[model samples]
Target: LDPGLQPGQFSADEAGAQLFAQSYQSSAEQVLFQSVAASWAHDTNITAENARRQEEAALLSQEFAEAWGQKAKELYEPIWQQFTDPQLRRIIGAVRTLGSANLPLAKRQQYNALLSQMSRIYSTAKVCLPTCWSLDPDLTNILASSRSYAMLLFAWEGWHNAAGIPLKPLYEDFTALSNEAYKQDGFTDTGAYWRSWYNSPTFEDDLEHLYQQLEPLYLNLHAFVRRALHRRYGDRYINLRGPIPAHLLGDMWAQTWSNIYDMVVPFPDKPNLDVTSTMLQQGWQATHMFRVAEEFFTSLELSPMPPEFWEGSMLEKPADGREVVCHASAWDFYNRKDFRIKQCTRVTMEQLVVVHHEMGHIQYFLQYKDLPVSLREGANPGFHEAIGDVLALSVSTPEHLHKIGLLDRVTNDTESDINYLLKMALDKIAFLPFGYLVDQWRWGVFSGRTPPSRYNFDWWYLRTKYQGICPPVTRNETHFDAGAKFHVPNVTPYIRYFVSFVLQFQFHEALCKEAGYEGPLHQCDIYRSTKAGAKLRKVLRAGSSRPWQEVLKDMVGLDALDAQPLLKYFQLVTQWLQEQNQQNGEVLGWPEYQWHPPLPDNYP
Candidate 1:
């Protein structure tokens, strides 16, 4: 229990203050203590026992929120005036903020249930067609490997409808309820709550500057891909210097153009050379992939995983007849030496990279286990999300691939370089504006700038505004298509990915400098470099104990987020993209920027 909570000898108003303090501590402890059970329930069978465990956890958490909020109205000033200690004040602030975010126990319960349903739908959904297809790869596999555009469209549409149709109303209602609670808390709106919640005064401005620097990269890459796609699909499917059709890009949303690797790469004669397939030829599984990921840290002399990590982790799909949420995630057990990852693993290149990403989260948990629960989160969510991916950037490099015996040597010719860069451009470069626009649209919706009626319209509006992407098909108010993406319905903050994308480049740059590497930043790989690994561990170990700006400054010597390192890293690719676009007589930025059709008068 909190020391500030007196056992007795208080008036009615002061009594509520003590109860609030007690509830805050006990509620947090219960949730933290039972986290292991709730996590396993989320990943494993939906038996009665599993359902009960998750339900009770949610119910207790809701009780705490409701109780604290009720008392908060009457006791806020009482507690504030009574507590002068700095730590006690910090606890009070956190409690008040948490209690005030959303109201009503039933509404929060529904939100949790909706989130669970969304996860279930993703796990079970599949594309079925009347064609002569016997095997339907999972949605991610279909998006990545399907050669026929028609099949890709079918699979993409299948999953979107499965998840989106059922979850739309719930999402709208949830947003409204959340905003109402923000108003109750004296906030302008949900957007205002989130923006002002962060302590850094310059956060918004720094984010804007970062996006500005990334816009040119996206536009040039968009142009290069459009021309390359035109050559692949013939002129009928692609208009020169005009918008490329989104469906043909292989992703449903066209947010990440990772699927078009087959069309853009210059080397077909060279082997596909998949390390996953090679591993399968030797009968390896997810365990081998996890081991490879752990080696990255071991080589750096970072802390080793406890025995419980191996014992408690769920690395592969269960053989039991149960539907599980296979969306890969890492979990840390409070007051216990247990860290685990829950994933439906496969022997694929994507899974290999994902294993590395998930392990990065685990290493972070290991490094910061000694911190108080209040300080045991990311410096900001973005820093937490970026740590794994930053390491992945170095791991995925061609030179690193060679070190792991996955490649003999990558070619250095112009064609090969362009091919490699194109693959990366689809995966990382294309994701930049997409990442930014998710939060951008959500903030608008939360602020009433984008109303519920215009939810569908403004979604596409911002897609075009920032991402420069056009829908593959005609869209209308009939569909809540944005909710189809997992993040939107799941209600995760998206700016983290955007920040991570830029930060990883800076982090990679800083680490390479530590490793004493000298070359174009794009071509440098710091694999097996102890110096680089040490610097990375130093940053990961800090967790949320310091402000993100201060932590970032200590990690990379930058007090604010900067996009210059990303620009420097991609300089060679940017040059190559411009040269390629020039050959096709296409402008780099959006040619339709000035001539895009005006929306209807009622358009959001």
Candidate 2:
């Protein structure tokens, strides 16, 4: 208990130390998976007739539902719970003890083995879960086999995150590439980024440039999906310039949710988790994200109200008539301008920030759903993501909301003004590191540093790396089943969130400059312009016909895709951090250096 115990001192090897206080619940999950997979594998008639039975059971019949659940728990639930619950607790402990001890090499190897098991399970389960409903019985049985084996053999990622390792930059690096086998999917052939994009000197620049190549790819996808969808259902389609009727919108919402589940059909057995499991895995995983988002909105100070739902009713109604206030899967596109799943949590403007942003996605698709399906649907997943991100930013500004008459108050007050501007900046800073950290976790899981058992721990570990907060959690219906599977890396490049993270700021800056806004860059009102609306309608509305850069240029300005905006965003955060430490009594324990020193006035 000496005061002289320095920050870097190693722990007194507590082999039996209470490092993590876990809530691990034991279950018959392994037996369950074996039973389900084995059943599908063995029975011919059951597999064929049983595919629809599973869906129906999930939807209706009580016995079918119970049996289905019984099979799931027998196979997936318990093992997932066992691994993730303890994992989260352990990571919290690890973060609390960063630099307290140097982990032994042997233990590190054992950790890596665990990670491998987690990765395959997640991938296989996601990939096969959908296909599990095949016409042929044998194919359905194979679904069980693939995902079950995958889950059991999954690995652990995010370990380095727990150790507080600095991520390497991505763009061009031999170190990251060399370690790609270890960093990439299951760490098998190195697809993971040994480094983080933030830490990399050229990563922002590199990410921006990469989008140049990716834009067309994304646009084509949107076009393909749209054309295909329209062709698939020739008779029942209505067009919109923004959003539409509630029921149809609901259909769009639901379709988006549904398509994502079946996306595995486009790919094969995964290099990540098998395609068989992606459906179930994502179903479980994606469900939590938006609800959290809704919670974020509860804190916002909404602008004054407009009786008419400006962009549609910014809320939703679940089929049960309860307000759908959480992140949810949607089937309709834009049921009606007045029909949004509004007001779940009370966070001021959080959901409005995110959902209305999502509304932008629905709006764009509804209006421009006629492109060659590929271009119409999701030209580039990231591009599709960007529509939401950009729109999220759009409403955050007083000017945008004000121009729309949503935030029209008395003569503008300076304090709220400055705070709102700064709030926007802080929001950007808080999200940047998280976006990067999540990718690290995703990449790590694929690299096999994330075993199914340690899957919860891996996620917890990644959270501490950049966030420095380890929220306690229960891990069930998670991606960690020993016999369950997920596919984060193979068919899905989860890094787009990170990519979108930086691009969000970039788009913001470009939008401001184009509007010729100055005097503290607040109160953007560009959306009211018919030109602005039409620009998005014509350019970005195309989904993914060109590169992201092209879309940016077309929608906002040519300079929109440049990394300068992202670079500036980082610079401001860095400068702010430095200023923070310079404040009396505000010195921090970590993130020692300033973000980027404030630039000389009028220098740029």
Candidate 3:
């Protein structure tokens, strides 16, 4: 059989279909098909030319999507007619469904090009904040520690206004096509539409319910942070009990508040551990950052990164000037022992932790190396997303940092741990609601609940409703602030992040319990625990061979997803936040008590 199957080859009557059907007869054959699909996927996205010229690659990817769609529709009738195995049918159904409703080739090509350009523009575009110098990509360190409210405000608005307002017209067209794709694929909207490929029919609902369950925790965190900001900066800089200015939390989106640790350090006198400075002290580069991540997996006795990973992976931007997908990802090549991470790596604590997370995907890819392609994925996308984060949770902990010598000079104290926990809350707990809302708003647009004329209006409305974070500057319908996020413009699925945020803690707790560590849930480290490491391996090896719940059951003893473990893990931090807020005459609850309603005068 030719390694590269042609477009019509998967048809029942075609030569390719005969080979495919034969291969589909067993796990081994399915593995071959899986590899073929994976090869197409990887090539479309990760090839050198593709990465550097994603706009061109995106058009090719659209063609690939159309080919797969055609194949799915062709194979559906015949494969459905012959296959009785539920799993086989399920996988085929997903392929066919996903391949079914693409825009006409010319239109798809156009959409892909626009999407590519928008994403490209977003990655490097610089914004001039009102009073501050200028803002570029989401910078954490400066945003976190800058005492200049003007700088913070300007930087925040700069990002929000940059791609968001400029791309409004494009986003409008993008939204129309996306919704059409959803309708053709038998979905009411794009948000819930992609669930078809995930192997969980209830996945969308599960995410919504998960968000609701975590709402109390999010509200508390939001209230505490908003109050803390208002108190620290005063009423002139912030509205007491009201929404925190986006930039005040550090970073563009306020998704992680670690940047603002300066204000909330449990002990202000003791300087926070400067991980970046330490990296500089070590004279480490981006590759060193990746090595730091590799240390975590190596500690667990996982397989070493294939030599090719270091040889071929893009650990940093190339010297030649060219645009590439800056977002980090683990690429698993179905053909050989080639597993690589494509990231424009940097020497930062965030990237250091991300290395572990991306490696989580690499490790999973390696674990299931021999499994049929269909079986070689995460139990679900969320679980796949969770594995790296689970590792990150442990890796990012202060105890782990100290052990790794990043925080060796910094003495551990009560306030330090509190500060660390608060940082975690900002990054992890704080992300829960933001993650939830991104898709929530996307779904609204897709479902017509959020109309085009009011796109920006509804964007902030959902942000306020869920995250309690508001734009530092007023935005009108002319802006597509939501499009500013990479996922929105690129149409990447987001609920997995929300799911991962909750599941990672659960995964960590379960692994810790398995390791028999008798300590606080947050402090428990599963590193170098042969027992925990083996248990993790056992589950990763299963891949998507069974229902995700079943795969999850093997590791966590429960097939269900819940935020209970997360709350338990952060219980102490939550208590401290509550106590601190109450001591300062601030209380956790709804937005009204925090600040005045969004009247024109109240907004500034």
Candidate 4:
């Protein structure tokens, strides 16, 4: 199992080196699988005993990974330099790049401890409004259902105070430890390490450029929504010209605005195409929702979920009063066929879309499971994030829903199309800046560009700069508002989601063409189109074996990420929004003046 390497020893040949790397990966996989499985258990059924076991397993996995990464650097450094075989180079590269490997044991322990603490803080956090409320259906439901400005503000601020303030010092320490670990692994800081996943020298600039492409559409959508809110909430609470208050956006983070669809819907008389009531009337259960999603994949000739998936997935919250984290995510067990999704699922149009999104990950996992563990992820992180979302682009279409019997008929009229597009834009188009800027904030923090003192200030600066949204109440250095979002505390790289938002539309358009559809981009459904499925499978099977550019070109004839497809997909909606904003005389962008809320007089 050790590959019998001494401190200065080298493998006898390239083949031997490859075998040694495989042996190391095989061992590493076992430890990682146990750790991930334990984590899944803890997340599904939160308990003190489960938390202890999860941390112990995670620490053991990290220790083993660190030791092997060190061994690879010592024993295989020369082999990596001299090896011309691409496979061998990849194996060695994977073995040596564990970021925490170079940290001293005590420092590594501190890093792991910080991560675990922040995660638990986020998972167990609850806001009390005379009654303790967790995020899932409690506070989130209030944000979605309550149109009262006062209640929305209270819920929004309450959750942030509970989740964000206590983690300020912990997050500060976590970032410092992460930067140290990344620097030890040949990065300038954690920001550099995250950008490296894109494998582009100009990754940061490219992200900005992509954002610029989508900014006009986002601004138009924002203007329309702001005007609508102004009509609803009036001058005192909602400004017609200023950034919309974050709480008014009908989401905890204002990331997606679909929850406020009724307020901003362009044509209420036209079919809104909401199928939540229909599904409920049809007696849809949690398993029924999943089964429908599985049928969708199978309809496209994609492989069905393995039996293990059905048996192991946690589709709904447990009935016995467990405090599980309910963020929806898909998992791969590294044993090739054991994939699962953990979601506290409900029967709603929103949750139905989420089901398809998570299943998209499973589809990718099933397709690429034969690859070595090192090569089993998306071509790039964004590509993986985009897979299910691409499928969702088709699954959520009115035409697809009609074909699948969820809708009684497809509404092909212009007003209905605009209404449909507006709903989609509220969810997808409104999310672009948020998806882009979360990482922008994190990257700034990781690079020491945004110091601890300016953490909350800079966060609002970027939020207004990119998103044209502001906090409900005055915020300051005293509050760690960024920590209120799960990704911030969890240290997950977020730019992947921004990139995925672009890629999903790009991939969707490509698959539509393969399906031989020639209608509006939004109307095409690749549901039973084996041609599209085959094209997608080619890209999925490549996994990370090739650079994303090459793999993307192989599927879509494009070598770089392009937002043209996304823009084109929503071209009609863009036109409608622009027309509506101009006709209504609504201002399109917020003023550039200092928009931060004034500090309270009592503040020290």
Question: Which 10 consecutive positions of candidate 2 have the poorest summed lDDT?
Answer: 244-253
Per-residue lDDT of 467 in model 4 = 87
User: Which portions of model 3 miss their true places by more than 4 Å?
Assistant: 1-4, 7-84, 98-101, 128-141, 197-205, 268-274, 318-321, 409-417, 593-604
TM-score of each: 0.86, 0.42, 0.85, 0.95
Worst 10 residues of 3 by lDDT: 129-138
Give stretches of model 2 more than 4 Å off: 1-326, 329-348, 399-417, 471-494, 512-520, 553-563, 566-577, 589-604
Give the Å shift of residue 61 in candidate 2: 24
Residue 311, candidate 1: C-alpha displacement in angstroms: 2.6
- Worst ten in a row by lDDT for model 4: 1-10
Model 4 segments more than 4 A misplaced: 1-9, 12-16, 78-82, 592-604
**RMSD, model 4, all Cα superposed?**
2.8
Q: Which candidate number maximizes lDDT?
A: 4
lDDT of 1 by residue, 1-604 (tens): 2333323332445455545555556446545657466847765775446655676676665555544555554566455646545434445555556533255666666656655655555455544554322112366677767765456556655666666666777777778777776787667777777766356778778788878878887888887777776666566555555565555666667777766666776566654534566667767678888888888778777766678888888888777746666667888877647788888888877678778878888888998877556566777777778877877777777777777877675676656665666677778889887888888889999888888789888887777777666654456776777887767875677888888888888898998899898976777777778898888777777766566777789778988788889888777778887777677677765556422322223422
lDDT of 3 at 15: 44
> Candidate 4's C-alpha lDDT?
0.83
What is candidate 2's CA lDDT for residue 407? 47
Error of 4 at 495 (Å): 0.4
Question: Candidate 2 vs candidate 4: which has greater lDDT?
Answer: 4
Better of 3 and 4 by lDDT: 4
